[model samples]
Each structure stands twice: as structure tokens, then as C-alpha cells.
Target: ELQLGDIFIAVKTTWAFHRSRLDLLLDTWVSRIRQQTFIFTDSPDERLQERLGPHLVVTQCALSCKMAAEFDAFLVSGLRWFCHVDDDNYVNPKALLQLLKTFPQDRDVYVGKPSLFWFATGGAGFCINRQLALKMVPWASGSHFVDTSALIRLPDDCTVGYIIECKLGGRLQPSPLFHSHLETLQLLGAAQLPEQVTLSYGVFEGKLNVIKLPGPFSHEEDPSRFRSLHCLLYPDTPWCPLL
Candidate 1:
């Protein structure tokens, strides 16, 4: 596997119920897998920062349109590869390692666990190259969701591809991987109900599967562990809160 210099994990949080659950999961699953992770809270409530502690890097911004802008700013420094993750989704560490291994350095961009047909939907997990981020920065003006807009705005010379219809082995099916304005409205209606909502427009690739892991649930349960571990393990540098 190619050694990645830095990997970014971005989580957008709006509500307390979801944020609490998401934070716990991140600390348990994502924090243990990747050394670098960046947690972004979009205009969170007052208690969010106190509850999450130093593990989360808070951001005060609106969702949808403003979210993309915040992401652009967060990634201004750039890295070899950046992975944007949803707050509620469960990530399989081993599966992610396999997926990263499959990435060819020659390519400009890579995506993992894409849903069936969604392109602009920001969930399913995608990787962005440093070079592409630089190119996108210039064109990211007034855009709400850069990932979707960038895909369409990609220059002719730049190649864009995805890992479509593949199921990268992971759990946390109930999480909101990605959502839009309409989805949000629907969520309000289905509040307190068990509903299966697809967050992205991509398919499942059955080939990619997660090995059985020992846990109470299919995925990890805490999010603060990631930040604590990073602080203890790589205290010298700024590691990604998302990884």
C-alpha cells in the first residue's frame, strides 16, 4: 500500500442527538484506524464544543451551501489524499485499508463505497488528490456543495472517476452519510422513526467486504477515542480528526 502523507475526515454536525451519536462512533471506529482526522461541526449548539472536547475541531457555518465553503477552507493546506466522511456512518478500518491500497497514485481522484446513481451526494466516501484540490479552490466561489459542483466543473484535462456499485465492507447503515435540503425536510417528518435513507447516489460493490470484527454492534461505538489516541500517539503534529 502507498503511504499517505495526510488523510482528512470531515464530519458535518447540525443536531445534538445526531452529533452525540456521531461523535461517539468517530472516537471508536475512525479514530483507531486513521492517524489524522478533522471533525467539522457546522454551526453547532453551545454544548457541542464542551461535550466533544479537543477531539473535535469546531466550525461555525451553515449547512448545504456554507458547508462546501468551510470544507474548502479546512483543506486549504492540502494533503496527499483527503477522505470526507459522514458523522453517523460506520467505517470499517480493514476495508478502508484495502480500498486505499487499490488507489493508483497516477490517478487524480478516487472514491470508495459509492451508492448507485448519486454523483453530487457527498456521503459514500471519496478521496481527493492534492492537485485536484488546488485546481478546485480557484473555481469554488459561491458554490454550496463543492464535491458535486466540482465533479461537473472539472476541467476537460482533469480525469474524474469513482468506485461505483461496489460495497466496501462496513456497517453503520442507519447513519446519514450524506443529505440535501429535501432529505433534511424528510428527516424532520421521519423523526423518531426507523427509516432506511440512502445518503449518496451510488451503488454497492459486493466484492469489497469487511472482515468480522468483535464489537457490541456491527461498528465501533465511540468517537472521542480517536482524538485522545491521536493526541497521545502523534502529539507532535496536527493529525486528521476525520481519519
Candidate 2:
């Protein structure tokens, strides 16, 4: 069985979203798994640092650079699992923990929602067990991930797939439970929402794409639907309506 502490959770964000995106996460899933979750951002915030302490990480870099930094941090974390997600994601800690329990950390496991039949969608979240991570040292450890990305002129997530799926000759374990904004979020039935490992929001054709769930909050109050989902999953949240 996998314990919450066994996993290293990294949430990537930018300075502009420190409040809008990050705060919702801080109040939801991050609060439930505070000890294991780390926020990676491009800018510094003294107030958040004072409140959250070491859990707040300022990478001070670009896309691939920030992702590379997250990999470096996971390598040094001494954890069994390394899971990365975008700031827009809403992670179900219990569901995530339970999903990891199905896989052995000692094996070469790369699981996530595959995109373009290639790289895992970073926005949906992806996981790398310690064994697989150790093997990726040559290509992904330290700043090498960025180096590899530069060599191929690809994005961070694509570079990761190239390293693991192409370079290392490992296969990605595509899972349906990992959800991304790239997919039609509204089509994910409400009954199917609770068991999903991760959920995300985005805009397409100027329309907001998000999960369809009955609300404790309006679209104005919770534009991304994260708050509504959180309340549906964990109604006992201090801010959620009393059951």
C-alpha cells in the first residue's frame, strides 16, 4: 500500500496565477496533503513563504526550466513517487493515493493521460516512480532535462516522453483516470467525477472548459469548478456547506 508521504507532489504555476490559481489549490487538495505537496512558481511571494514555509518553491525560470527544477527537486526528495501537475489542476488526494497503490514504486512506471499518443499531459498530472526516475538521471536529472529539451526543440512534457519512451525504451502506462483540459471536460458525467485522479480547466474557442458538476458555488464564485468539485468530494470542508 502506498502512503501519502511516499509521494512527492509538485504543482507548477506562474507569478500572475499565484493567487487566482494557486490559492484555490492551497485551500483544497494541498491543504489535505500539506506535508507532501510543493508549489513551484516563477516568482517569489514573501507572504506565502511566511505562511507556507519550505513548501513554497520559487524556481525563477521559464517553462522547461521550471519543469527541470521540479524534476531536480523530486530527485532530492527521497520519495517513492514523483507526480507533477499544473496550477489549474484539482487533485483528489485520496484517489491519487489509491491509484498509486496499484503500482509498485520499485518498477519503471510512467503513468498519466497520454496526449497526441506521445507525452503525458502535464496539466492532467503524471507520475514517475523512483526507480524510473533514477534511470532518467542521464537525461532528466539536474538541468539535463532542459538540455534535452533544447536539443530536440520540444516542450517540457514532450521532452520527458522522448527521454523515457524514446531514449530509455520504457512504455507509458496511459490511464483514463487522469483528466486534462485538452479533453471535453463537460462530457465527463457527474457520477464519474469523484473517482478521477486529477481534473483541470481551460479555454477553447473563447469558452471555458470544465467538469460538469452540481454546485455549491456559482460560475462567478468558482469559475474553474474546482470549488464545486471539492465540496462534492469532501463536503466537510470548513468553507463548504454543512452536510
Candidate 3:
């Protein structure tokens, strides 16, 4: 049997990019979490062994394949639910709590809206039953993009539902969150959206919320790598703060 209190965070990091901010972000975010949450950092750098210290469960992976393999390995360790958040991306506390409240334990898969877009991205959120993880392990390959692809491969008999069109907007402020490496790409262009880009209440909050962020939330400046990638990825959509 799985318990609702068990939540795991699987983070992947590279040597070139130090992930100290990610650790800080997790600490801050998890601080307010009512459940017991664990942090798993996948890295191959021996330097990280000392950097992560006793604060986190650090696993060494020489490559993306190894990282994915380790992620699968950790999944088999009796975690009731888990979310794979990118090193960059800010999670709204109230929104996360509300979202988790609606998560159905009996379901095989639960998807959340990514801060970047309505679609589910590894950077967004994903959770599964412990049994579901066990069933999916043998099929887990060592791939950087395993989460999204693997979920798509699940059998039809499995129950998979998305939290569609749910609004979760707040102040987009900078903090020690997952910052993207592709910051330069965001400042290259100004998007000129078509007037035909219609908006409807139903469309905004349907199985996925496709609405843009409002004023204070809309005004972002000098975004981190994470924010930049999110903006670049969804040029026309609103992005949550990547602090």
C-alpha cells in the first residue's frame, strides 16, 4: 500500500552547470510541504559528492542514460508519489497544494500543467503510484527524455488523466530556483501574435489552462535560464517565475 505523504523529487544535473540553486529551491519549496518529501540529485561529478554533502541523496551518473537508469532505480524504492521537476522552474505553493488535493490515488498516472505551457513537460510535473513505477521500470531506458516518452507508451488499460486548463498564476520573481542554460535565446525576438488567437473561458480552464499571466505576473525582466527557456518554448503563453 502507498501513502500520500511520500513525495520524491528526481533532479538531473551536469558538471558544467552547478545545481546549487536547484537544491535551494527544493529546500524552500519542500519546507512548506505538509508531506515528507525526498530529494534525489543525479550527477556524475565527484565534486558533487562533497557539495551535496549529507543534505541530499546524491547519485552519480556519467551520462544522461545513467541518470535515467538511476531514476528508474530510485522509483523501485517504495515511493508512493513522485514529481520530476527540472533544475529550473518555480512551483506555486497554493497551486501545488490544490493540485495534489485533486490527485486521484487509484489512477495510474497524474499530469500537471508545466510552468512553461499547458502541455506536460518533465519540467512541469508528473506523479505515479508505486505499483505503476514497478510496472514501468523494466521498460525504462537510459534516455534524457524518458518521462514524457515513457508515459506515452503506457498501456491503454492504464488510467491517465491530465489536469487541464487550471489557472495557477502568481508573482514571477527570481530566487534560487532552476535556471535554464538557454537564456540568450529568449531576447532574440518579439512575438507578434495573430488577432485570430481567440480566447474563451472554457478553453482557458478546460482539461488544461491556456490563459496568459496577468500584470505584475506578466512583467518579467532579466529572466534566468529556466525562465528564458520557458518563454522561448511557449512564446505566446504565460510562464511562471523561474526563480
**Judged by TM-score, which candidate is best?**
2
Task: Encode model 1's per-residue lDDT on 22-124: one tens digit a residue.
Answer: 6555445545554455556655555445545543555554124434644564477465666665664444444444455555666555454333323334554
In model 2, which residue pairs have backbone atoms overlapping below 3 Å? Answer: none
Q: Alpha-carbon error at 208 in model 3, in Å?
A: 24
* Every candidate's lDDT: 0.41, 0.84, 0.38
Positional deviation of residue 155's Cα in model 1 after best superposition, in angstroms: 20
- The best candidate by lDDT is 2
List TM-score per model, in order. Answer: 0.50, 0.92, 0.46
RMSD of each: 12.4, 2.5, 13.3
Give the per-residue lDDT of model 3 (tens digit) for 126-196. Answer: 44445555544433442353334534443211212211222112111212122122221222222311111
Q: Which ten contiguous residues of candidate 1 have the minimum total lDDT?
A: 162-171
**Poorest stretch of ten by lDDT in candidate 2:** 142-151
Choose 1 or 3, whichever is better by TM-score: 1
User: Per-residue alpha-carbon lDDT of model 2 for 45-92, expressed as tens digits?
Assistant: 976786578898998552377887888889899899999999999898
Clashes of 2: 0
